[PDB]
Amino acid sequence: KIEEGKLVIWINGDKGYNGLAEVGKKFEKDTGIKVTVEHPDKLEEKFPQVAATGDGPDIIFWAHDRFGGYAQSGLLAEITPDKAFQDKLYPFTWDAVRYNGKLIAYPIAVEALSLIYNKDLLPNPPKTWEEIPALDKELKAKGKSALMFNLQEPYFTWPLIAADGGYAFKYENGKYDIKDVGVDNAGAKAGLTFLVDLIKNKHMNADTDYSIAEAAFNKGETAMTINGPWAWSNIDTSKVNYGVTVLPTFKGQPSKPFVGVLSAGINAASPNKELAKEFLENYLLTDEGLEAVNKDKPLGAVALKSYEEELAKDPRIAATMENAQKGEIMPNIPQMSAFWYAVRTAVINAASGRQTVDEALKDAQT
């Protein structure tokens, strides 16, 4: 089953896993141990299944929201870097991976969705969501569409749902209150209703997913899309003249994307904990390490101060930071898994008309 004197790493397929593998080779030539990087589908859901018993990777990469649940289940090893090392990263990134007063992962990058647009189809991006319907009608006459993004993952629709007031768990008394969910308040209803109407009026298809949206934008068929930094690499290859800017506002309010801190956790059942900490602390969290990953697929803003200093000059990164500042960092509480599953169902069902917005959100709230 598990293997000692070896490092198995899991990371999402849309990230720079080939770049990460290069950092792995560096580690291998210095320590002698081989590093295998894999990118299984739905790894965030398989991890708890294999880790719960005798299996799983040594290191797992994913946004910090899922880590609270893993920790509560005892699937992650506690991390205790010295305070000096902690000072090489921004304080809020460590708070994102802190659970029950203990660090349970190494923060890597700060991720936020931005509005990406094709300058040859739309020289000036819309400042408001309400302007999209009219914009689409104009483009439809030319055989094009205004906007396409992954509707199957709630992460992409959340910025709109939260824009006018929607929220996940209210934070009060120094903790998230799981009995106070805001996915069905006035703001959330207004946001999802706007999305449902956009679909009803044929300004977007309810079946649009990541692949469909990415192909449409990279082929120059749709004027805009909503995605993260990791997607910029594929667009550069398409030669499309694109810009990355602030998400449109809704009801005069800015869109509020959920900010994720890409983090690296160590399997509690791993026999190579010290090796894993050395790889993350000494090899990945360095200018050269992050640069190798970034070169493959952009990480966006990074937790490492020294490297962020070099990336902050990129206008695309500035846009990423602006959307992140208008959004909110995701909670890492155990209930996040349920929250995401609930909202995923609500958005899909409401978008396709299989459920009313009110019943869909009421069920998600529950």
């Binding site: 969910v181 155990p334 209930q335 349920a338 909202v343 709230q365 529950t366």
Partner: peptide
């Protein structure tokens, strides 16, 4: 459903 396990 959001407050469940």
């Amino acid at each position: 459903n959001s407050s469940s396990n």
